[PDB]
Amino acid sequence: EEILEMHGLRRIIFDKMTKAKQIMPHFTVMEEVDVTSMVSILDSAKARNRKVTVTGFLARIVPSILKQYPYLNAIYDETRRVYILKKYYNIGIAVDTPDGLNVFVIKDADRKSMVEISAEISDKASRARENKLQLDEVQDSTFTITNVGTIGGIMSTPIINYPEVAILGVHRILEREGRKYMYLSLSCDHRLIDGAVATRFIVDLKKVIEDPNA
């Protein structure tokens, strides 16, 4: 066998993790979403004004509900028993780059329209692959979203990006009967966030992918 060691980016992502759930107890909850009301909304706009990705539409909605539920847009400090509830919203996006999993951020997401946020993730991801991305662009994720759906998968239990307080898992689309379905999940620090309040969050969010007309 060939023993192989640890890298830079690999040593980072190793470390982020060994710590993330060294000190954040993970709770994870899910619902499903009648995404048919969603799915077509991109297809009509993928018709005129490419693009809006699935990643891209979600990041559009997610902030305005973290607005109602503040406990989820927050950070975990080393002053120990402490807080940082961030009022501004820069959301993280986990992408696969040939070296290892890289998180980056959408500058004030609660400001950007559908297309912009989607043109940006396009801008940064292929730039994230060619490993030419900059110090400021990977920093200050108040919250973060992980899509596996462009590969596959029903539902996962993702590990929260430290030191945020919450992460959200996008997955593959379904087709139950005869509507378009998809499972979403939520993982969080089960101390700064209850059971109930994590779930109360996903339903208010679900309701705006349920009703994009709201």
Catalytic residue numbers, as ranges: 190
Give the tokens for residue 72: 């989820």
Among 47, 48, 78, 87, binds its own copies (CB under 8 A): 87
Among 48, 152, 213, 214, binds its own copies (CB under 8 A): 152
From the list 23, 14, 64, 9, the residue with the least C-alpha distance to 163 is 23
* Cβ 85 vs Cβ 70: under 8 Å: yes
Q: Write out the binding residues for its own copies, residues 93-132 only, by CB under 8 A.
A: 94, 96, 100-101
Nearer to its own copies, 114 or 188 (CB): 188
Give the tokens for residue 51: 């693009």
- DSSP label at residue 162: T
Among 21, 51, 107, 127, binds its own copies (CB under 8 A): 21
Among 43, 49, 85, 111, binds its own copies (CB under 8 A): 85
Choose the stretch contacting its own copies; rule: CB under 8 A; options: 45-53, 56-64, 87-95, 131-139: 87-95
Q: Is 150 strand, coil or helix?
A: coil
Helix (H) or strand (E) segment spanning residue 92: strand 91-95
Nearer to its own copies, 27 or 57 (CB): 27
- DSSP label at residue 161: P
> Cα–Cα distance between 146 and 119 in angstroms, integer?
17
> What is the nearest approach in angstroms of its own copies to the Cβ of residue 47?
28
> What is the nearest approach in angstroms of its own copies to the Cβ of residue 3?
4
Tell me: does residue 139 bind its own copies (CB under 8 A).
Answer: no
- Among all chains, which residue has been given the structure tokens 């109930």? 196
State how far the alpha carbon of 172 is from the alpha carbons of 54, 154, 163, 169, 193, in Å.
Answer: 10, 6, 27, 10, 27
Q: Write out the binding residues for its own copies, residues 169-208 only, by CB under 8 A.
A: 172, 174, 176-177, 183, 190-192, 194-200, 202-203, 206
* Cβ 26 vs Cβ 161: under 8 Å: no
Among 13, 39, 45, 119, binds its own copies (CB under 8 A): 13
Tell me: does residue 22 bind its own copies (CB under 8 A).
Answer: yes
